[PDB]
Amino acid sequence: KTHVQLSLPVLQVRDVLVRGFGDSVEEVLSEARQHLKDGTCGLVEVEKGVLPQLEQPYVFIKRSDAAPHGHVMVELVAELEGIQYGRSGETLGVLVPHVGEIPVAYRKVLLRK
Numbered sequence: 001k002t003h004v005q006l007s008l009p010v011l012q013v014r015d016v017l018v019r020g021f022g023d024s025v026e027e028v029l030s031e032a033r034q035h036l037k038d039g040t041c042g043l044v045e046v047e048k049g050v051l052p053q054l055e056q057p058y059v060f061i062k063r064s065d066a067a068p069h070g071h072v073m074v075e076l077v078a079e080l081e082g083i084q085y086g087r088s089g090e091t092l093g094v095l096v097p098h099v100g101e102i103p104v105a106y107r108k109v110l111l112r113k
Contacts, residue, residue: 003110005071006036008043009103013050016042017076018097020055025085025094030096032059032076036111042098043107046091056080062088064112071110077082 022033035041043061044050057080057102065073074093077086092107 001111002044003073004036004113005110006041007071007108008041008095009101009105010093011042011044011098011101013044013076015084015100015101016044016087016096018055019101020057021095022057023089025057025080027066028057028059029076029078029085031053031097033113035054035095035097037076040098042096042101042103043093044074044096045093054096061092061109061111062086062094062111063090063092064088068110071108073110073112075112 021028058076060077061074062077064075076090077084077088
């Protein structure tokens with residue numbers, strides 16, 4: 001299927017134990033997609049102070065359309081040293097590995113795969 005419905009655990013930034021997916025733009029998009037498929041991907045909502053507490057390259061989910069069954073359609077965009085790889089809409093948050101942290105909420109999305 002070209003899209004998959006997921007419900008992503010929303011994590012507080014200071015609880016995150018593994019603060020990024022890897023060391024290159026290509027690796028972090030790859031690992032983010034793998035973790036989404038395996039159900040081991042969390043979401044950190046971006047506010048002042050958040051991104052400097054996480055590791056670059058970043059992987060964002062961004063809105064890709066103006067929302068079936070409650071799930072916002074999203075796509076992945078990576079960022080490294082101020083340059084983004086991908087072009088999309090408003091950021092819904094930054095993706096990180098989930099390794100058991102307790103979430104504050106869940107965010108329903110329809111992920112373009």
